[PDB]
């Protein structure tokens, strides 16, 4: 999507493996706020929005 | 009410303890009042704050 009309994907009822994304060599930026990028797989959320 | 003088002492101390305990639920500016939640989410460099 264009940034003025960004696309929101709602994610729920699933297993979220964030190490696949974090340990990827294909991303130039991966900045986490309010949470450690290496503790994500130990956490549970009520929803994730992408 | 005859023994109010003794009951008042009991009430004041019970109240003081209840208040002290309730303060543990305050954030004081932190992301959470729960120490375990902070530690489970953040790494030391940020958890410390």
Residues A24-49: b if buried by 16+ CB within 10 A, e if exposed: eeeeeeeebeebbeeebeeeeeeeee
Contact A36 B43 (CB under 8 A): yes
Q: Which residues pair with A10 in a beta bridge?
A: A49
Distance CA B32, CA A13 (A): 25
The 3-class secondary structure across B5-48, one letter per residue, is HHHHHHHHHHHHHHHHHHHHHCCCCCCCCCHHHHHHHCCHHHHC
* Residues from chain A contacting residue B42 (CB–CB below 8 Å): 34-36, 39
Query: What is the nearest CA distance from B26 to chain A, expressed in angstroms?
Result: 18
Contact A39 B46 (CB under 8 A): no
User: CA dist A7 to A2, A21, A28, Å?
Assistant: 8, 19, 21
Distance CA A32, CA B9 (A): 51
């Amino acid at each position: 999507a264009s940034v003025y009309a960004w696309n929101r994907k709602r994610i729920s009822n699933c297993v979220a493996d964030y190490s696949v994304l974090y340990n990827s060599a294909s991303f130039s930026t991966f900045k986490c706020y309010g949470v450690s990028p290496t503790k994500l797989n130990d956490l549970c959320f009520t929803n994730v929005y992408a | 009410s005859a023994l109010g003088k003794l009951q008042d002492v009991v009430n004041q101390n019970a109240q003081a303890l209840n208040t002290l305990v309730k303060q543990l639920s305050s954030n004081f500016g932190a992301i959470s009042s729960v120490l375990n939640d902070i530690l489970s989410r953040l790494d030391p460099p940020e958890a410390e704050v």
